[PDB]
């Protein structure tokens, strides 16, 4: 992260596509180095067979300038997350902050 930054890097790092954002709020149920499985809160379940969510993070692969796009988890196991919050730090991000 940068020490001296304007109050803007969170909206830039979220509103782009390089990070993964939880669509519904709930409890972290499984985190590997590759993927994140989230149990959904029961208030946010439409009543027909909602269940869980699965995010498959993108691993080491090619970008157009031959740099290495990467994703990593930033939540711990059994931790609560909320709708609209970050889960996967992409490239040059840090906890939902743009960090070049």
């Amino acid at each position: 992260k940068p020490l001296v930054g304007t109050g803007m890097e969170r909206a830039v790092a979220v509103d782009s596509g390089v990070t993964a954002v939880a669509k519904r709020g709930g409890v972290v149920q499984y985190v590997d180095a590759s993927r994140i499985v989230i149990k959904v809160n029961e208030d946010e379940m439409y009543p027909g067979e909602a269940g869980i969510d699965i995010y498959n993070l993108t691993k080491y692969t090619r970008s157009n300038q031959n740099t290495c796009i990467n994703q990593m988890p930033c939540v711990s196991l059994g931790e609560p997350v909320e709708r609209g919050d970050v889960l996967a730090d992409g490239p040059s991000t840090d906890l939902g902050e743009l960090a070049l």
Binding site: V31, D32, A33, P73, L77
Partner: protein
């Protein structure tokens, strides 16, 4: 003329890491000379021990992700760069590691090889997050003197490898920072004598007494090359 010689007084240690060592008798000018000379020699070249090669069961190449493990393999290598290991009688030791269960794999979980001891047993490596998770690796700790990157050793081998090895560049320097001061010494009927205070922070591997004696041994060898001039 008829000048004094230093001695070695009061090795205080504030913590496990950092000490300050005091040299009580000094002449007028020699405080800064010995302070800067020992600061340079201790920062540059000391015997250290660090991790060179890592082999993990079930990982072909680095840039992969073992299942169950929270970090990548790359972050496990960047964690094992920072491992404080004192080797007492050898030059290369193959430590092992085996762990299962949910929890952090801590460096205390290394199978105790005996003569090798671990300075800091609270250092984290990875975090296993599953019942059916099991990390099992073989770590190579080697003794060296400077700073050697990966590719120099890569083209120094040139002959063969198996695939599962990962090379990790070493960091053979046990000290981290050194600051010295020169203060007014107190020897009877005399006011123009000085005193060194050397404050050094290491990684916990090496005793400060041995450090100062070995630095003075190196400087003595260089000036023994000087004295016999032509």
């Amino acid at each position: 003329t008829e000048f004094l010689k230093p001695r070695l007084v009061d090795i205080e240690q504030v913590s496990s890491t950092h000490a300050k060592v005091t040299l009580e008798p000094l002449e007028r000018g020699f405080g800064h000379t010995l302070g800067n000379a020992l600061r340079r020699i201790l920062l540059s070249s000391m015997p250290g021990c660090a991790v060179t090669e890592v082999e993990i069961d079930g990982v072909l190449h680095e840039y992969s992700t073992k299942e169950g493990v929270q970090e990548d393999i790359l972050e496990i290598l960047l964690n094992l760069k920072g491992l404080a290991v004192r080797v007492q009688g050898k030059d290369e030791v193959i430590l092992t590691l085996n762990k299962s269960g949910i929890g952090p794999v801590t460096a205390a979980d290394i199978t105790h090889d005996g003569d090798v001891e671990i300075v800091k047993p609270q250092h984290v490596i990875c975090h296993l997050t599953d019942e059916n998770a099991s990390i099992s690796m073989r770590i190579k700790v080697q003794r060296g003197r400077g700073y050697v990157p990966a590719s120099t050793r890569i083209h120094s081998e040139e002959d063969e490898r198996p695939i599962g090895r990962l090379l990790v560049d070493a960091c053979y320097s046990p000290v981290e920072r050194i600051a010295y001061n020169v203060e007014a010494a107190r020897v009877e009927q005399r006011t123009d004598l000085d005193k060194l205070v050397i404050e050094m922070e290491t990684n916990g591997t090496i005793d400060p007494e041995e450090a100062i004696r070995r630095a003075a041994t190196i400087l003595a060898e260089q000036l023994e090359a000087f004295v016999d001039l032509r």
